[model samples]
Target: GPIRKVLLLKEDHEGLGISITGGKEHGVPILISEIHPGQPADRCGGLHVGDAILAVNGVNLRDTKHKEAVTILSQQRGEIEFEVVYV
Candidate 1:
């Protein structure tokens, strides 16, 4: 499946989400490395590359993977919880 969208996860540490831009063309099992300009995570500030995504809209990364994360993040909005692994 193609991960066309990156999710904006709300983290507890307020560090990073995932490098959405970095993953393009790479494929999932894909490690994130950068962000896009004016993206949801970027516009919010605090998120950056090397940051491992743990969840989107409260869904855990352990439960979700590449396209799943993208689906949850892009598809979900409003108040949500996130768990992220910081680099």
Candidate 2:
């Protein structure tokens, strides 16, 4: 599928409720591995397993390493914007 923008809102003390894997170091794009039940990401209905996360809140993850991408994702709060594409 073509790239699309997804917005997910996180509540206090709660997470985006999605798991990710892959990265530039792995010679792959950062992709969603799973979506937790009843979480912000799941509730948004815009994310899915195997969707490559190209950017998060305007920060490009296309070329980021695994750890770097993880750090960026973990730092986001409230409304999070994700640029993604289904592979």
For each candidate, what is the lDDT? 0.50, 0.95
lDDT of 2 by residue, 1-87 (tens): 899999999987998899999999999999999999999999999999989999999999999999999999999999999999996
Q: Candidate 1, residues 5-74: lDDT per residue as tens digits?
A: 2445543544333354222234433344676666556765655565555555556564444565666655
Assess the local accuracy of residue 69 in candidate 1 as a C-alpha lDDT between 0 and 100.
60
Q: Provide the lowest-lDDT 10-residue window in model 1.
A: 21-30
Q: What is the TM-score of each candidate against the true structure?
A: 0.53, 0.97
Clash tally for model 1: 0
Which pairs clash (backbone N, Cα, C closer than 3 Å) in model 1?
none
Instruction: List residue ranges in candidate 2 displaced over 4 A.
Output: none
Model 2 lDDT on a 0 to 1 scale: 0.95
- Report the number of the highest-TM-score candidate: 2
For every model in order, what is the number of clashing pairs?
A: 0, 0
